[PDB]
Amino acid sequence: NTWQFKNMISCTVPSRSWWDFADYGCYCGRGGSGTPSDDLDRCCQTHDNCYNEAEKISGCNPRFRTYSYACTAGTLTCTGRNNACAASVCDCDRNAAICFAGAPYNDSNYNIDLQARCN
């Protein structure tokens, strides 16, 4: 559930919006390519690999799967009531939000020319 992923980012990095990560580096946003260019972006790359793995599960649609989780005072917890797919996806997003709140945000990396930077 792409939406739940947005809430997580806010739960760990309230000073920003997912938009700040919607077009950052080579891997954040959606499709990746080239060298991460940044720790923060490296986080996004891992997030993709995670989804690629989660997609091996039968009929698992990471983007649309609604999972069960909790954000309490900045802490993210994937709950137990999820099944194989929801559990895997929830974990990916959960790990990304933490990786996000741990990495510095380089404004000069927002909106770069993927053509001359991610080849």
Added chain:
Amino acid sequence: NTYQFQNMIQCTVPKRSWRDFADYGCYCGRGGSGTPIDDLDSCCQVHDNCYNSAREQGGCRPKQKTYTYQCKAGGLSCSGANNSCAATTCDCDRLAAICFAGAPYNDNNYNIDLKARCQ
């Protein structure tokens, strides 16, 4: 798959590298949200939706799925020897590629600030 879809774009839009459609408007290349900004960006929206409809099929992943197609004289054709999934994702790419050839390309709509333009 992408290399196939990318090769389709090279077929109907030889004067332009596929990289030009990797970050155009609010829907081309990236995941997409908000309102299209031109006919081209709109083509990408339709492509997005087409792919999401191709997910309704068991074990069908447009991005990774390989299909059979031909590019000749600029005219794309999806072969009849394609299963349900391949046949649909191919058709998606075919229509997208054709739409790219007719839609005008606006440089002002390439690598735009999503946060301020999409919503």
